[PDB]
Amino acid sequence: CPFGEVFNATRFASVYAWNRKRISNCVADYSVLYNSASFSTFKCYGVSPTKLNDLCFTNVYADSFVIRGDEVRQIAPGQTGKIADYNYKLPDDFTGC
Amino acid sequence: SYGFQPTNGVGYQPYRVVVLSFELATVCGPKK
């Protein structure tokens, strides 16, 4: 999958202008994702990383942006904060990683 | 309001965040 130019890009767009690119017609190696943890944070809600290999998903969505460390807490179900209230509200039943 | 400096504390360093969304075929597992 064309993930080299997306994850390893030199510059990322702004948070207000986050770039979303549709990914289709390729094979994604999730074994790299769940068998290695170079990524400090890996939070998945509603899905199991084990069943990713044995399941096929359609219309894959990926949002990438840059934020600061202490705001990771606020992006969670059943949580309050300035950002989650006045900037952008996420559903409580959000499913993804 | 964001403070990004080389001499800042390690805490204020920027973080790349990638969120994968699933909404209820072409892409599958790494073959078998």
Epitope: S36, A37, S38, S40 | G11, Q13
Partner: antibody, heavy 121, light 107 residues
């Protein structure tokens, strides 16, 4: 003068529930990850996972079976590990250490405790 | 499905020469590497972790360096009691995987 002391060795009969504790003091307990390390006697270490008291997020080792769950209490700022049904595989000694801060990126477990030995027989 | 090999298994060199062993994983492991010393009648125990944190009382003879796919091992002072089995050790924040290992004996 910060000192961290773990609980002593515990031996319990099969079928009984045992809870071990690791207490941190002199710092924000929920602002630092707590790391747990398991080792079978006569063999090497098996790194199972670490839990943040901020959200109680649980990460499992690839050889996990879901038998044991990790819970933390934010009221007393003390880490706990519980086994609902002790078995032969639970016989080991465990190390609890303060992991990398969630703000830092270079991993480190700063301090070493004396360890807590759990024996099932 | 995963087949990894370590080469060369055996090396012959004169006294004072440098011997370096390399072990590679399926993907890049950055600098996640530790060194274990295994005795005959004793179990291996981790002494230095992350190669940058030193526990009180741990001798300085153990050290680690290198990142990516190339690693180099340097002996500050060779000792007769240094004979052991060195295991390439990769780890992450999710878990840990034991490598096959390579048994090297020095007379």
């Amino acid at each position: 003068q910060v000192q961290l002391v773990q609980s002593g060795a515990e031996v319990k009969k099969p079928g009984e529930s045992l809870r071990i504790s690791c207490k941190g003091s002199g710092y924000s307990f929920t602002n630092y990850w707590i790391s747990w390390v398991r080792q079978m006697p006569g063999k090497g270490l098996e790194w199972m996972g670490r839990i943040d008291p901020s959200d109680s997020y649980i990460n499992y080792s690839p050889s996990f079976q879901g038998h044991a769950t990790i819970s933390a209490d934010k009221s007393i700022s003390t880490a706990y590990l519980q086994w609902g049904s002790l078995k032969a595989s639970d016989t080991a000694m465990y190390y609890c250490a303060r992991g990398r801060n969630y703000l830092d990126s270079r991993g480190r477990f700063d301090y070493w405790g004396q360890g807590t030995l759990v024996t099932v027989s | 499905d995963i087949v990894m090999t370590q080469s060369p298994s055996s090396l012959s060199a004169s006294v004072g020469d440098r011997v370096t062993i390399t072990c590679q994983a399926s993907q890049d492991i950055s600098n996640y590497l530790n060194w274990y010393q295994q005795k005959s009648g004793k179990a291996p125990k981790l002494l230095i972790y992350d190669a940058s944190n030193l526990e009180t009382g741990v001798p300085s003879r153990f050290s680690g360096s290198g990142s990516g796919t190339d690693f180099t091992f340097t002996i500050s002072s060779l000792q007769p009691e240094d004979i052991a089995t060195y295991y390439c050790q990769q780890y992450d924040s999710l878990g840990f995987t034991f490598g096959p290992g390579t048994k090297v004996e020095i007379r």
